[model samples]
Target chain A: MIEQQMDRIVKEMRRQLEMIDKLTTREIEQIELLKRIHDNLIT
Target chain B: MIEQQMDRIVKEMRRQLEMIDKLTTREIEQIELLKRIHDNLITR
Candidate 1:
């Protein structure tokens, strides 16, 4: 029973991270927005 | 068969993210490099 539960957990965790890999668009958008702010900040 | 291939793909993608996540917030060199361009642009 314990081993079966772990398999389920492992599979779910992998699926969850896989979903994050597809959500990388927002990470990149934030980086670009960060760049724009830095550009505006010091110079 | 199709499910098997997708499982493998998901497994690998997760590992790559885990590695990069460790590398992400700890790196400060990218910000220093970013600062350089602004410095040069302002000085020009």
Candidate 2:
């Protein structure tokens, strides 16, 4: 089955990209909070 | 067939981790430099 629709594949890729964006933003916020606490402890 | 070796797979994973570390360090450095430049431009 090598005859997939281009539009469907593109739509799926966009959905995956949105999920990645949300996951990355949440992960970065968590990391930033931890880093702030780490710096406070060091100082 | 299933003739895989555990030692070989572990060694390969270790090598991949080292590669990931190197790539991540380089990417962070580049991102930091770009951020610094962007901040400076905004301030000026």
Q: Which candidate number has the best lDDT? A: 1
Off by over 4 Å in 1: A22-25, A37-43, B1-44
lDDT of 1 by residue, A1-43 (tens): 5455457557767766665664563456546646765665643
DockQ of each: 0.13, 0.03
Per-residue CA lDDT of model 1 for B1-44, tens digit only, reads 65566556556656766665655443444555555655666665
User: Which residue pairs come into collision in candidate 1?
Assistant: none
- The fraction of correct interface contacts reproduced by each prediction comes to 0.00, 0.00
Per-residue C-alpha lDDT of model 2 across residues A1-43, encoded as one tens digit per residue: 2233334445545655555555555556555544544544333
Give the best candidate by DockQ.
1
Give the true-structure RMSD of model 1: 6.6
Please give the range of 10 consecutive residues that has the lowest summed lDDT in model 1 chain B: B23-32
Q: lDDT value for candidate 2?
A: 0.50
